[PDB]
Design a protein around this ligand. Structure first.
Ligand SMILES: NC[C@@H]1O[C@H](O[C@H]2[C@@H](O)[C@H](O[C@@H]3[C@@H](O)[C@H](N)C[C@H](N)[C@H]3O[C@H]3O[C@H](CO)[C@@H](O)[C@H](O)[C@H]3N)O[C@@H]2CO)[C@H](N)[C@@H](O)[C@@H]1O
Ligand SMILES: NC[C@@H]1O[C@H](O[C@H]2[C@@H](O)[C@H](O[C@@H]3[C@@H](O)[C@H](N)C[C@H](N)[C@H]3O[C@H]3O[C@H](CO)[C@@H](O)[C@H](O)[C@H]3N)O[C@@H]2CO)[C@H](N)[C@@H](O)[C@@H]1O
Ligand SMILES: NC[C@@H]1O[C@H](O[C@H]2[C@@H](O)[C@H](O[C@@H]3[C@@H](O)[C@H](N)C[C@H](N)[C@H]3O[C@H]3O[C@H](CO)[C@@H](O)[C@H](O)[C@H]3N)O[C@@H]2CO)[C@H](N)[C@@H](O)[C@@H]1O
Ligand SMILES: NC[C@@H]1O[C@H](O[C@H]2[C@@H](O)[C@H](O[C@@H]3[C@@H](O)[C@H](N)C[C@H](N)[C@H]3O[C@H]3O[C@H](CO)[C@@H](O)[C@H](O)[C@H]3N)O[C@@H]2CO)[C@H](N)[C@@H](O)[C@@H]1O
Ligand SMILES: [Mg+2]
Ligand SMILES: [Mg+2]
Ligand SMILES: [Mg+2]
Ligand SMILES: [Mg+2]
Ligand SMILES: [Mg+2]
Ligand SMILES: [Mg+2]
Ligand SMILES: [Mg+2]
Ligand SMILES: [Mg+2]
Ligand SMILES: [Mg+2]
Ligand SMILES: [Mg+2]
Ligand SMILES: [Mg+2]
Ligand SMILES: [Mg+2]
Ligand SMILES: [Mg+2]
Ligand SMILES: [Mg+2]
Ligand SMILES: [Mg+2]
Ligand SMILES: [Mg+2]
Ligand SMILES: [Mg+2]
Ligand SMILES: [Mg+2]
Ligand SMILES: [Mg+2]
Ligand SMILES: [Mg+2]
Ligand SMILES: [Mg+2]
Ligand SMILES: [Mg+2]
Ligand SMILES: [Mg+2]
Ligand SMILES: [Mg+2]
Ligand SMILES: [Mg+2]
Ligand SMILES: [Mg+2]
Ligand SMILES: [Mg+2]
Ligand SMILES: [Mg+2]
Ligand SMILES: [Mg+2]
Ligand SMILES: [Mg+2]
Ligand SMILES: [Mg+2]
Ligand SMILES: [Mg+2]
Ligand SMILES: [Mg+2]
Ligand SMILES: [Mg+2]
Ligand SMILES: [Mg+2]
Ligand SMILES: [Mg+2]
Ligand SMILES: [Mg+2]
Ligand SMILES: [Mg+2]
Ligand SMILES: [Mg+2]
Ligand SMILES: [Mg+2]
Ligand SMILES: [Mg+2]
Ligand SMILES: [Mg+2]
Ligand SMILES: [Mg+2]
Ligand SMILES: [Mg+2]
Ligand SMILES: [Mg+2]
Ligand SMILES: [Mg+2]
Ligand SMILES: [Mg+2]
Ligand SMILES: [Mg+2]
Ligand SMILES: [Mg+2]
Ligand SMILES: [Mg+2]
Ligand SMILES: [Mg+2]
Ligand SMILES: [Mg+2]
Ligand SMILES: [Mg+2]
Ligand SMILES: [Mg+2]
Ligand SMILES: [Mg+2]
Ligand SMILES: [Mg+2]
Ligand SMILES: [Mg+2]
Ligand SMILES: [Mg+2]
Ligand SMILES: [Mg+2]
Ligand SMILES: [Mg+2]
Ligand SMILES: [Mg+2]
Ligand SMILES: [Mg+2]
Ligand SMILES: [Mg+2]
Ligand SMILES: [Mg+2]
Ligand SMILES: [Mg+2]
Ligand SMILES: [Mg+2]
Ligand SMILES: [Mg+2]
Ligand SMILES: [Mg+2]
Ligand SMILES: [Mg+2]
Ligand SMILES: [Mg+2]
Ligand SMILES: [Mg+2]
Ligand SMILES: [Mg+2]
Ligand SMILES: [Mg+2]
Ligand SMILES: [Mg+2]
Ligand SMILES: [Mg+2]
Ligand SMILES: [Mg+2]
Ligand SMILES: [Mg+2]
Ligand SMILES: [Mg+2]
Ligand SMILES: [Mg+2]
Ligand SMILES: [Mg+2]
Ligand SMILES: [Mg+2]
Ligand SMILES: [Mg+2]
Ligand SMILES: [Mg+2]
Ligand SMILES: [Mg+2]
Ligand SMILES: [Mg+2]
Ligand SMILES: [Mg+2]
Ligand SMILES: [Mg+2]
Ligand SMILES: [Mg+2]
Ligand SMILES: [Mg+2]
Ligand SMILES: [Mg+2]
Ligand SMILES: [Mg+2]
Ligand SMILES: [Mg+2]
Ligand SMILES: [Mg+2]
Ligand SMILES: [Mg+2]
Ligand SMILES: [Mg+2]
Ligand SMILES: [Mg+2]
Ligand SMILES: [Mg+2]
Ligand SMILES: [Mg+2]
Ligand SMILES: [Mg+2]
Ligand SMILES: [Mg+2]
Ligand SMILES: [Mg+2]
Ligand SMILES: [Mg+2]
Ligand SMILES: [Mg+2]
Ligand SMILES: [Mg+2]
Ligand SMILES: [Mg+2]
Ligand SMILES: [Mg+2]
Ligand SMILES: [Mg+2]
Ligand SMILES: [Mg+2]
Ligand SMILES: [Mg+2]
Ligand SMILES: [Mg+2]
Ligand SMILES: [Mg+2]
Ligand SMILES: [Mg+2]
Ligand SMILES: [Mg+2]
Ligand SMILES: [Mg+2]
Ligand SMILES: [Mg+2]
Ligand SMILES: [Mg+2]
Ligand SMILES: [Mg+2]
Ligand SMILES: [Mg+2]
Ligand SMILES: [Mg+2]
Ligand SMILES: [Mg+2]
Ligand SMILES: [Mg+2]
Ligand SMILES: [Mg+2]
Ligand SMILES: [Mg+2]
Ligand SMILES: [Mg+2]
Ligand SMILES: [Mg+2]
Ligand SMILES: [Mg+2]
Ligand SMILES: [Mg+2]
Ligand SMILES: [Mg+2]
Ligand SMILES: [Mg+2]
Ligand SMILES: [Mg+2]
Ligand SMILES: [Mg+2]
Ligand SMILES: [Mg+2]
Ligand SMILES: [Mg+2]
Ligand SMILES: [Mg+2]
Ligand SMILES: [Mg+2]
Ligand SMILES: [Mg+2]
Ligand SMILES: [Mg+2]
Ligand SMILES: [Mg+2]
Ligand SMILES: [Mg+2]
Ligand SMILES: [Mg+2]
Ligand SMILES: [Mg+2]
Ligand SMILES: [Mg+2]
Ligand SMILES: [Mg+2]
Ligand SMILES: [Mg+2]
Ligand SMILES: [Mg+2]
Ligand SMILES: [Mg+2]
Ligand SMILES: [Mg+2]
Ligand SMILES: [Mg+2]
Ligand SMILES: [Mg+2]
Ligand SMILES: [Mg+2]
Ligand SMILES: [Mg+2]
Ligand SMILES: [Mg+2]
Ligand SMILES: [Mg+2]
Ligand SMILES: [Mg+2]
Ligand SMILES: [Mg+2]
Ligand SMILES: [Mg+2]
Ligand SMILES: [Mg+2]
Ligand SMILES: [Mg+2]
Ligand SMILES: [Zn+2]
Lengths: 49, 105
RNA sequence: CACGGACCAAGGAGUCUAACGUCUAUGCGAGUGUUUGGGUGUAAAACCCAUACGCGUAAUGAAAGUGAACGUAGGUUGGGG
RNA sequence: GUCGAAUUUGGGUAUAGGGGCGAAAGACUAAUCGAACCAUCUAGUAGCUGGUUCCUGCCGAAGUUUCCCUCAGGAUAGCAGAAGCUCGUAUCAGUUUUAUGAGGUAAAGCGAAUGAUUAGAGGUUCCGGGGUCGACCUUGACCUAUUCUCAAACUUU
RNA sequence: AGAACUGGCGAUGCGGGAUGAACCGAACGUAGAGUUAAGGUGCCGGAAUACACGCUCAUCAGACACCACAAAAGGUGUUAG
RNA sequence: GUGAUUUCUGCCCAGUGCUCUGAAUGUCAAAGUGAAGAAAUUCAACCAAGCGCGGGUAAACGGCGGGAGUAACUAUGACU
RNA sequence: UUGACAUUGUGAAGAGA
RNA sequence: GAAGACAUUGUCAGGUGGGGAGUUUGGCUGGGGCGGCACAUCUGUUAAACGAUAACGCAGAUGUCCUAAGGGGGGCUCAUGGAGAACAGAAAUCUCCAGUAGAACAAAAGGGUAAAAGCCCCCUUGAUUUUGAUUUUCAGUGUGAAUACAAACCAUGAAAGUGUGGCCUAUCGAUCCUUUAGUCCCUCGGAAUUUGAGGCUAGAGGUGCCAGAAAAGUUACCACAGGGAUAACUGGCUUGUGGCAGUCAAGCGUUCAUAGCGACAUUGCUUUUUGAUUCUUCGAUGUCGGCUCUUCCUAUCAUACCGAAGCAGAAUUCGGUAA
């Protein structure tokens, strides 16, 4: 999605390739806004066994 | 400005037309009841769909507001309204200044 | 060294409508308007007509209201005839 | 460039316009795509370009005032045409004369105020401060009459 | 670039400035004759290669408002003072 | 999201988001109750999520400084 | 998503100013 | 079997909601933008001796402040300087003389004022009621501000008088709505009483883009109507800037102004620099450099002929006719 144009995906903002706003979306988010880490409780590398 | 809490001025009371003593208060506007016709016309407009209807002011350039002095007749009880010029600070019954005083402390 | 126009013919752009202002012509005139309708007919014409209605004959107040002669319907100064 | 596989391909079939479809170019969706094609609302609105059809006769402008989300536009007054009407030299006049006001520009003034500005001379500080000596000379500060040159925001005149 | 006053151009041809929005002269029905303006009168070109006193010789002389540029500084060129 | 293999992937959760069987009365609708009223109404209390508070979270979006002291010529600054 | 009202019937304890 | 008056379905209510829908995102402007306010105003000057008068002209100022810094009376006279007094010194408080304003009057500036308009003290609330007229701006509308009255009712002083805010020139606000006071008034139209509401007059809450919309961005994916009223090449005026050259000759050059040079100044040219401007072209004049080729300029690098030298020769340097 970060590779598309803004029409095709919220990520699709260009001129560099970056998401530009938090990649963690709410649960109460609306169809069409939900892309990326959806209900995400936490994020990043864990190493939790 | 500093104004006194009392002044002797002409009264329009039909019982006494002459300079009387007046309790000098300051104006504050009322609660603006919901049943004034405009407000129930507005709430009509405001309903349904179509979002905001009457405008919403934004561009305000005023620092102050004009100070309206209500004067209540001590005897005949009838109130009259008087308005001041613009001021940033207004106190009624403020402490009169005094000349020649040592600059304090 | 700004734009349209290679040429010819034909076509090609301030209209009608409703409500109005000034002005003018006309009818009648403190009145006026036959044509909604009816009568009538040589039949969309022409001719004719009741009741109404519209505007005018009073203004002024937001409104309840009130409602225009002291005087040859006034005084002074002009004024054509 | 690739050429035995994410290979090339027929036909059948599916997804349709703020929709599809996209190994992502805003690409593709019938020579049409940063929103298809068709008809209608639609003679859409245009302070913006363009055009606007016979002849003669008389008169004859404006780009200024004020207000405007006013500055390529309006309203407004002015300039202009027409229609006239009341009267017949009543009244006037982009002119002078005489009488009587008002003005502070040009010029002028700075040994007048103000502000600026060159030069000496005289006179108190007996110094503001240091020296020469167990009070005399420099420095400045003031003061007096002079001298050169200035003013849109100086000025008697 | 921007004000003041008036005159103009625009909206206007005519004669003059060769040429030309705005300069000079003059403003315009159709014509004849006379006279002029501004400008001209060697030849182009209508009009004295007119009269008069001087000055000027330039191996880019100069030649007429607006107007189509030249300065300081020099010259034992020549002229007057 | 990143983009084979190898190797490594640091610091920062204050912000913007995401997330939490985390303290609260702080704010907080409509229905509901209470008070006053002849009623229309006014006035209160109580109160959901949310906000507000608190916790976590950067292979979430993203961030990684300006100053000065300081070692025997100078210089630099392992040090504060 | 949250509350209310209605779909909405039948019972029991034990608690709130 | 599970599940159970939960849930689901329904209707309101609060929250969330660029996923989606609309819409919007000033003006002036030596192009736009950025800045700025020349957008509402005030003083001085520009302004050309009535009045008016422009530029993003020059020096400044305003969105305030004051129960007195308003109103009246009275006494008094201020800047500043000289000469004089325990500590007391430059600076304390006291005195006399001088003192046309050289001070003060909120503030910008200008004007105005000396038995005051200043300082000081005394009393008051004309910073009030009513409602018209007049001046500035002007359309002779509004608004702001102001002037002279009338009708009341007050202050002040012995009084005559003066006072309708601040000595004068600036210090501000429509309709719609809300709101408060006033008249105790009108109306809710089948008739009444109360509550509520709607009026009349007068204030306030504000529009500073100040005659008064309710408003964020991006587009190199772009679009339309126009514009040479307008920027980005040429060309045109200008020549500050850039380039080139004069004049005077203090000085340089051992000596010696000028062989060769040249400060302070000053007169110029040029348009292969850059600006300034915005006339031409926006229904289109192909935008850098190079290559190629022609021709012109001369402010001459070489070459021909020369003059000068601080030219012995050699070299060099200055110059003339030369493109
Ligand atoms: N020659 C005398 C001088 O000039 C004048 O005197 C007289 C005339 O020269 C002067 O004429 C002036 C004229 O200059 C200029 N146009 C101004 C003004 N409009 C004229 O004056 C006249 O104007 C019109 C009539 O024309 C009248 O309505 C007006 O009342 C009258 N004063 O009008 C003056 C009175 O009739 C000045 N008053 C004065 O300088 C002095 O007397
Ligand atoms: N006023 C009458 C006229 O005065 C004229 O004379 C004028 C001048 O001569 C005279 O100037 C005198 C001067 O003469 C005398 N020697 C010195 C004196 N200070 C000057 O005085 C004048 O100038 C000074 C400024 O210099 C001003 O401050 C002063 O007010 C002014 N009057 O001032 C006079 C004007 O005030 C003529 N004599 C004549 O036309 C007639 O008499
Ligand atoms: N040159 C002397 C010194 O310079 C100044 O003073 C000089 C001037 O300022 C002063 O000039 C005169 C004066 O003589 C005379 N008596 C009084 C006059 N007002 C002064 O005027 C001076 O100032 C005014 C502006 O205020 C100027 O307009 C005027 O041109 C100027 N001369 O006199 C001095 C000589 O002309 C200093 N004030 C002072 O130290 C001392 O006098
Ligand atoms: N080379 C061998 C000889 O030397 C000769 O000698 C010449 C050179 O040494 C020197 O000439 C110089 C030259 O060096 C330099 N590069 C150019 C400069 N313009 C010349 O200058 C000379 O010659 C020119 C033109 O002829 C003259 O106008 C000038 O007066 C003269 N000084 O000066 C001599 C001529 O005056 C020539 N170079 C050459 O022709 C001859 O055969
Ligand atoms: Mg892309
Ligand atoms: Mg998006
Ligand atoms: Mg992006
Ligand atoms: Mg990109
Ligand atoms: Mg890119
Ligand atoms: Mg990347
Ligand atoms: Mg990335
Ligand atoms: Mg987002
Ligand atoms: Mg009485
Ligand atoms: Mg409703
Ligand atoms: Mg609703
Ligand atoms: Mg009042
Ligand atoms: Mg007032
Ligand atoms: Mg041309
Ligand atoms: Mg065109
Ligand atoms: Mg053409
Ligand atoms: Mg063409
Ligand atoms: Mg054609
Ligand atoms: Mg053509
Ligand atoms: Mg042909
Ligand atoms: Mg008619
Ligand atoms: Mg028939
Ligand atoms: Mg009738
Ligand atoms: Mg009566
Ligand atoms: Mg009678
Ligand atoms: Mg009469
Ligand atoms: Mg008579
Ligand atoms: Mg390849
Ligand atoms: Mg191969
Ligand atoms: Mg296929
Ligand atoms: Mg469709
Ligand atoms: Mg759309
Ligand atoms: Mg679908
Ligand atoms: Mg593909
Ligand atoms: Mg793209
Ligand atoms: Mg096609
Ligand atoms: Mg296609
Ligand atoms: Mg394409
Ligand atoms: Mg598009
Ligand atoms: Mg299609
Ligand atoms: Mg087709
Ligand atoms: Mg049409
Ligand atoms: Mg239509
Ligand atoms: Mg229209
Ligand atoms: Mg326009
Ligand atoms: Mg506006
Ligand atoms: Mg045009
Ligand atoms: Mg007109
Ligand atoms: Mg007329
Ligand atoms: Mg006179
Ligand atoms: Mg003067
Ligand atoms: Mg003047
Ligand atoms: Mg002068
Ligand atoms: Mg003089
Ligand atoms: Mg003075
Ligand atoms: Mg003074
Ligand atoms: Mg001396
Ligand atoms: Mg005299
Ligand atoms: Mg000009
Ligand atoms: Mg003039
Ligand atoms: Mg002229
Ligand atoms: Mg004309
Ligand atoms: Mg003419
Ligand atoms: Mg001619
Ligand atoms: Mg000529
Ligand atoms: Mg001519
Ligand atoms: Mg002349
Ligand atoms: Mg001849
Ligand atoms: Mg001549
Ligand atoms: Mg010439
Ligand atoms: Mg030329
Ligand atoms: Mg010459
Ligand atoms: Mg000469
Ligand atoms: Mg000579
Ligand atoms: Mg000689
Ligand atoms: Mg001689
Ligand atoms: Mg990632
Ligand atoms: Mg990649
Ligand atoms: Mg990391
Ligand atoms: Mg953080
Ligand atoms: Mg955080
Ligand atoms: Mg946290
Ligand atoms: Mg509630
Ligand atoms: Mg309940
Ligand atoms: Mg929860
Ligand atoms: Mg903690
Ligand atoms: Mg951050
Ligand atoms: Mg830094
Ligand atoms: Mg650091
Ligand atoms: Mg440092
Ligand atoms: Mg450092
Ligand atoms: Mg250091
Ligand atoms: Mg240390
Ligand atoms: Mg150190
Ligand atoms: Mg060290
Ligand atoms: Mg060291
Ligand atoms: Mg360090
Ligand atoms: Mg260091
Ligand atoms: Mg540390
Ligand atoms: Mg629910
Ligand atoms: Mg519940
Ligand atoms: Mg229930
Ligand atoms: Mg239960
Ligand atoms: Mg959204
Ligand atoms: Mg949108
Ligand atoms: Mg603009
Ligand atoms: Mg913009
Ligand atoms: Mg700007
Ligand atoms: Mg105005
Ligand atoms: Mg004003
Ligand atoms: Mg003037
Ligand atoms: Mg004047
Ligand atoms: Mg007095
Ligand atoms: Mg004195
Ligand atoms: Mg003085
Ligand atoms: Mg006073
Ligand atoms: Mg003053
Ligand atoms: Mg004064
Ligand atoms: Mg006096
Ligand atoms: Mg009296
Ligand atoms: Mg009075
Ligand atoms: Mg006032
Ligand atoms: Mg108001
Ligand atoms: Mg009201
Ligand atoms: Mg009342
Ligand atoms: Mg009733
Ligand atoms: Mg009723
Ligand atoms: Mg009532
Ligand atoms: Mg309002
Ligand atoms: Mg508004
Ligand atoms: Mg505006
Ligand atoms: Mg602004
Ligand atoms: Mg305006
Ligand atoms: Mg947009
Ligand atoms: Mg540009
Ligand atoms: Mg130059
Ligand atoms: Mg030039
Ligand atoms: Mg130069
Ligand atoms: Mg050159
Ligand atoms: Mg020497
Ligand atoms: Mg020599
Ligand atoms: Mg340069
Ligand atoms: Mg142009
Ligand atoms: Mg140009
Ligand atoms: Mg063209
Ligand atoms: Mg073009
Ligand atoms: Mg072409
Ligand atoms: Mg060509
Ligand atoms: Mg092309
Ligand atoms: Mg170019
Ligand atoms: Mg030459
Ligand atoms: Mg040579
Ligand atoms: Mg060379
Ligand atoms: Mg020698
Ligand atoms: Mg050599
Ligand atoms: Mg050589
Ligand atoms: Mg040379
Ligand atoms: Mg050649
Ligand atoms: Zn009373």
């Amino acid at each position: 999605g970060v590779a598309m144009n803004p029409v095709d995906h919220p990520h699709g903002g260009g001129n560099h390739q970056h998401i530009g706003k938090a990649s963690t979306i709410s649960r109460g988010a609306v169809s069409g806004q939900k892309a990326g880490l959806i209900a995400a409780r936490r994020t990043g590398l864990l190493r939790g066994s | 400005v500093n104004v006194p809490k009392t002044r002797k001025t002409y009264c329009k009371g039909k019982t006494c037309r002459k300079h009387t003593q007046h309790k000098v208060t300051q104006y504050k506007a009322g609660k603006a009841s919901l049943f004034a016709q405009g407000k129930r016309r507005y709430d009509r407009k405001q309903s349904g769909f179509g979002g905001q209807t009457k405008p919403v002011f934004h561009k305000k350039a005023k620092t102050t507001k004009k100070v309206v002095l209500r004067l209540e007749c001590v005897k005949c009880k009838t109130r009259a309204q008087l308005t001041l010029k613009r001021c940033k600070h207004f106190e009624l019954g403020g402490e009169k200044k005094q000349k020649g005083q040592a600059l304090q402390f």
